[PDB]
Design an enzyme around this catalytic site. Structure first.
Site, PDB file in Angstrom:
ATOM      1  N   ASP A 511       0.733  -1.108   0.079  1.00 59.47           N
ATOM      2  CA  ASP A 511       0.027   0.020   0.005  1.00 59.47           C
ATOM      3  C   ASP A 511       0.822   1.266  -0.077  1.00 59.47           C
ATOM      4  O   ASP A 511       1.782   1.287   0.780  1.00 59.47           O
ATOM      5  CB  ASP A 511      -0.910  -0.221   1.230  1.00 59.47           C
ATOM      6  CG  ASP A 511      -1.943   1.053   1.213  1.00 59.47           C
ATOM      7  OD1 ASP A 511      -2.908   1.044   0.178  1.00 59.47           O
ATOM      8  OD2 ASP A 511      -1.812   2.007   2.116  1.00 59.47           O
ATOM      9  N   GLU A 540       1.985   0.451  -4.928  1.00 62.03           N
ATOM     10  CA  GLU A 540       1.572   1.729  -5.652  1.00 62.03           C
ATOM     11  C   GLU A 540       2.585   2.645  -5.704  1.00 62.03           C
ATOM     12  O   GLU A 540       2.994   3.264  -4.683  1.00 62.03           O
ATOM     13  CB  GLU A 540       0.102   2.424  -4.652  1.00 62.03           C
ATOM     14  CG  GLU A 540      -1.091   1.672  -4.624  1.00 62.03           C
ATOM     15  CD  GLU A 540      -2.137   2.149  -3.647  1.00 62.03           C
ATOM     16  OE1 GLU A 540      -1.700   2.130  -2.424  1.00 62.03           O
ATOM     17  OE2 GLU A 540      -2.883   2.923  -4.234  1.00 62.03           O
TER      18      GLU A 540
END
Ligand SMILES: OC[C@H]1O[C@H](O[C@H]2[C@H](O)[C@@H](O)[C@@H](O[C@H]3[C@H](O)[C@@H](O)[C@@H](O)O[C@@H]3CO)O[C@@H]2CO)[C@H](O)[C@@H](O)[C@@H]1O
Ligand SMILES: OC[C@H]1O[C@H](O[C@H]2[C@H](O)[C@@H](O)[C@@H](O[C@H]3[C@H](O)[C@@H](O)[C@@H](O)O[C@@H]3CO)O[C@@H]2CO)[C@H](O)[C@@H](O)[C@@H]1O
Ligand code: CA
Ligand code: CA
Ligand code: MG
Ligand code: MG
Length: 917
Positions: A511, A540
């Protein structure tokens, strides 16, 4: 010496190593001092003098080591401490930097951020040790890093949470760690660390008990940590030690086959009446072999879905694990009122003494729900406060499974249940497992929050702080962590090691990886590859504004490293628009998958040039979004991938397609179906929209990047237009594995975030009928056709960027292209090298994202044939109605996908050689 005289504000002094203090407030002042007090605040006495002890600082020049470590501070005025300072004594309490004029009048006084000197003093020694409650041959060794604490006691609790012992721990001077060594009888014991530690936020020497940041087991709701040996056979399902990864991840060709189904524990089973009631919303639902959900996943696996990615299954904070404090929508409204005082004081309080369940009430509210009366979400927003539902991007403990997904959250039971699920996915469903990890923030910080763990034990170290105020930054959403600090980097790597070794996780999705240093992600990967050489990392890697502090782990900076990143290029080109769109932009910004250019809606102003630009991004993504891949762009120009623009950035960024994760739907933002519903022209009928969904997914599934998708895209999943559904409950996140509907049109979404979209929602929502069993079954067939095609040949998944460049090409390019027709060729002929597929000399992928039939002459005279997989699906195929004429011309119907092949003969043939450019 001169007494300073005549308060403390902000925290803009930085004690960055043993003898360096960086502070703007001490510039040009003749008296610069670092005052300190062990047990109280550095303050002025009744006289107005500063009587606390101090260390005098002389101005100096920032060292090269300091500027390398903290480039965002490299322009701060530097000051030197005497080389004989007892840093350990100053770090036990409050330190304040004080500047004064030549007479001793105070100019400014501020608090000191000490994370840098903590690393410079203790990190190397502390990094050499292991942490947590560690069972050994001789017994147990507890260790916690707390280099500023004045006291640490190990508090041992009985099963009923009575204190049975409080042990002063032994401080190691070199490392600042505290340890306590005991007997093996402490197995299973509950414990906390009683801290006596100065917290710079409160400026108090705080006293509190805290759970272990290296906890590997917990009591219910994480109140106490628990001594566990994860190797214990009693915590393992039968045959656990022999569990193997069903899908290879060794070579880049192996990795490229990765086809991910991003799933959530409640989204899977909360609604499935064929999962035993006791297992709904639980890890163990994956063992319910006869259930609709498990049978559906088994068929997806058989058809070429290879990986299950699990939304947070580490210990999240935002579900109460005490069942008696929770009410879910399947339970009586009377239960909701007894656990939720906001409901009891609301307009819905009249339902408290009714005999309805919450979901029965929500169901009756649907008929009169609208933008002018969003009553479904009004009730559901209250339900969300006390239900079992959250995505869980709210880390409480990084290395324990979540308790609410276990049938018994008290103690070690969840560990075996989690492993039973992992074994079921790998052995019985045949898929690898990826865990979503969230090391970029904590749920809370400071000295008072129930869920602040790290920032209670070593205050101001594990969180990233504003350089001036010392406030914990919140760029992530929440309490930003500091993976650039050595002992949190170590915590991350140690945590990943447990998930890898003890829970047999096959890969990790980071994340908000952009808030991590490139160097830290790579160091973690180096350390985990020693444990599992085939582990895969991705995350990400968007562009972040932490680039001033360190080189970030972004798409651009990870080129060539083997760390994957989600690509937003194909995503936005095919979906249309971007995540930040609101209002009419949600409809205006059509994508390739919803007919940009070729089937415009009534609001869009998209030009043909703009539509063809989206096709350039899409083609580039189907070839793995490589920086150096060469294509012909919308104007006929020869362009490398890095020269195709994506909102001002170089579009192609990767060195190998295994560095790129393509997708058109994810837990974040609107589902694919809801995007198509926002964007499709009013005259696009329901069957057309189903084909739009499949055409959109085909760009991912038949592309060279790793393929990623949201649980339920194969069922046209809707969230009733909810953009950010993390706390929107079972109601809006429902996935119906009985195939009755796709959860579309079940009420207006949460007004707090989607209220600005109510007008456009009301205008588009009822354009066509809500999907039912017929459309759901046809979409699942389309989806499994696409994954089966990807799985069937190694040509779809070449893995190596140079090999993609030697084999992959496009037709129907340039200024005379037929808009919306994507035609990709993959060579297996003599000019490519070896034949990788004995059955074919080449493959053609044709995606006709358009309302016209299209004819191609590019393969005239070749032996081209429609794939047997698609022929076998007949009129249920995405290629239904495709014509391959005698002369090799190919005609595709509207909204179709055709995979064609050159059959291989006695020897390797000529194939489809990449055109010279
Ligand atoms: O109350 C805490 C926090 O809750 C909300 O933040 C949540 C987001 O709304 C939600 O989308 C999710 O965000 C994560 C994305 O799903 C993930 O893919 C990636 O982009 O990271 C995001 C952060 O981890 O979860 C967060 C946290 O629960 C709310 O918006 C915040 O204001 C609030 O502080
Ligand atoms: O962090 C809290 C935040 O989480 C979620 O926002 C995420 C977006 O959903 C997600 O698309 C991504 O946004 C990036 C774009 O995709 C990318 O193209 C580029 O523009 O960078 C964007 C981030 O800078 O990540 C964000 C951040 O997590 C959730 O939807 C929000 O509601 C929530 O506030
Ligand atoms: Ca909730
Ligand atoms: Ca900053
Ligand atoms: Mg929890
Ligand atoms: Mg071949």
């Amino acid at each position: 010496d001169v007494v300073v005289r005549l308060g403390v504000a902000l925290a803009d002094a930085h004690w960055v190593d043993k003898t360096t203090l960086l502070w703007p407030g001490g510039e040009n002042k003749p008296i610069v001092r670092l005052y300190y007090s062990h047990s109280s605040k550095v303050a002025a006495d009744s006289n107005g003098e500063f009587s606390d002890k101090y260390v005098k600082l002389t101005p100096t020049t920032v060292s090269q080591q300091v500027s390398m470590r903290f480039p965002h501070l490299a322009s701060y005025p530097a000051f030197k401490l005497p080389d004989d300072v007892n840093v350990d004594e100053l770090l036990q309490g409050e330190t304040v930097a004080i500047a004064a004029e030549s007479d001793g009048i105070l100019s400014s006084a501020t608090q000191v951020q000490t994370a840098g000197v903590l690393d410079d003093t203790y990190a190397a020694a502390a990094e050499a040790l292991s942490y947590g409650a560690q069972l050994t041959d001789s017994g147990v060794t507890f260790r916690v890093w707390a280099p500023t604490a004045q006291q640490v006691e190990l508090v041992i609790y009985s099963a009923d949470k009575k204190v049975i012992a409080s042990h002063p721990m032994t401080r190691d001077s070199a490392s600042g760690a505290w340890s306590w060594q005991g007997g093996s009888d402490l197995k299973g014991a509950f414990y906390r660390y009683a801290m006596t530690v100065y917290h710079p936020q409160s400026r108090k020497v705080e006293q509190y008990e805290v759970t272990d940041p290296y906890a590997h087991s917990l009591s219910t709701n994480s109140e106490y940590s628990q001594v566990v040996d994860l190797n214990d056979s009693a915590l393992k399902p039968e045959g656990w030690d022999g569990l193997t990864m069903p899908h290879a991840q060794k070579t880049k060709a192996d990795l490229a086959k990765m086809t991910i189904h991003e799933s959530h524990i409640r989204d899977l089973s909360a609604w499935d009446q064929t999962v035993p009631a006791e297992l709904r919303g639980k890890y163990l639902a994956l063992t319910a072999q006869e259930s609709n959900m498990v049978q559906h996943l088994k068929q997806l696996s058989a058809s070429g879905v290879t990986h299950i990615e699990l939304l947070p299954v580490f210990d999240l904070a935002t579900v109460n694990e005490f069942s008696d404090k929770v009410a879910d929508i399947q339970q009586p409204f009377s239960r909701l009122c007894e656990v939720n005082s906001a409901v009891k004081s609301s307009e819905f309080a009249g339902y408290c003494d009714s005999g309805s369940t919450v979901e029965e009430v929500l169901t009756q509210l649907k008929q009169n729900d609208s933008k002018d009366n969003p009553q479904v979400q009004a009730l559901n927003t209250l339900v969300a406060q006390t239900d079992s539902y959250n995505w869980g991007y709210d880390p409480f403990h990084y290395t324990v499974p979540e308790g609410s997904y276990a049938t018994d959250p008290e103690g070690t039971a969840r560990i075996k249940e989690f492993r039973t699920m992992i074994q079921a996915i790998k052995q019985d469903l045949g898929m690898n497992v990826i865990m979503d990890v969230v090391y970029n923030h904590t749920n809370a910080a400071g000295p008072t929050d129930r869920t602040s763990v790290l920032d209670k034990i070593v205050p101001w170290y594990y969180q990233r702080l504003n350089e001036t105020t010392g406030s914990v930054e919140s760029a992530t959403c929440c309490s930003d962590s500091a993976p650039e600090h050595r002992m949190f980097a170590k915590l991350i790597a140690d945590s990943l090691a447990v998930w890898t070794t003890d829970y047999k996780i096959d890969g990790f999705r980071f994340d908000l990886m952009l808030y991590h240093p490139k160097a830290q992600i790579l160091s973690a990967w180096e350390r985990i590859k020693a444990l599992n050489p085939d582990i895969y990392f991705f995350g990400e890697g968007w562009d972040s504004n932490q680039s001033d502090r360190f080189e970030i782990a972004s798409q651009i900076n990870l080129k060539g490293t083997g760390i994957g990143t989600f690509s937003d290029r194909l995503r936005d080109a095919v979906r249309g628009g971007g995540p930040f769109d609101s209002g009419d932009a949600l409809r205006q910004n059509q994508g390739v998958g919803s007919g940009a250019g070729v089937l415009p809606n009534e609001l869009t102003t998209l030009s043909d040039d703009q539509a063809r630009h989206l096709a350039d991004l899409t083609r580039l993504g189907m070839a793995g979004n490589l920086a150096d891949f060469v294509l012909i762009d919308k104007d006929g120009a020869v362009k490398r991938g890095s020269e195709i623009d994506y909102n001002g950035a170089p579009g192609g960024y990767a060195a190998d397609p295994t560095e790129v994760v393509n997708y058109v739907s994810k837990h974040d933002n609107q589902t694919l179906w809801d995007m198509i519903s926002y964007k499709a022209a009013q005259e696009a009928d329901l069957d057309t929209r189903v084909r739009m969904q499949a055409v959109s997914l085909a760009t991912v599934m038949l592309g060279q990047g790793i393929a990623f998708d949201q649980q339920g895209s194969e069922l046209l999943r809707s969230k009733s237009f909810t953009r950010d559904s993390y706390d929107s409950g079972d109601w809006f996140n429902r996935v119906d594995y009985s195939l009755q509907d796709n959860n579309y049109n079940v009420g207006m979404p949460r007004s707090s975030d989607d209220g600005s979209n109510y007008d456009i929602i009301a205008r588009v929502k009822d354009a066509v009928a809500t999907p039912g069993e017929t459309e759901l079954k046809q979409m699942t067939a389309f989806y499994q056709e696409l994954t089966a095609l990807r799985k069937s040949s190694p040509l779809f998944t070449l893995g190596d960027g140079a090999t993609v460049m030697k084999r992959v090409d496009f037709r129907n390019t340039g200024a005379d292209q037929q808009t919306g027709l994507l035609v990709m060729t993959i060579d297996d002929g003599m000019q490519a090298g070896a034949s990788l597929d004995s059955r074919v000399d080449g493959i053609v992928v044709a995606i006709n994202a358009a309302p016209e039939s299209r004819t191609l002459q590019d393969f005239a005279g070749t032996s081209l044939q429609l794939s047997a997989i698609q022929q076998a699906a007949g009129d249920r195929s995405l290629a239904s109605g495709v014509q391959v004429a005698a002369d090799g011309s190919v005609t595709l119907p509207a909204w179709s996908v055709a995979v064609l092949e050159l059959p291989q003969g006695e020897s390797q043939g000529a194939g489809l050689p990449v055109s010279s450019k």
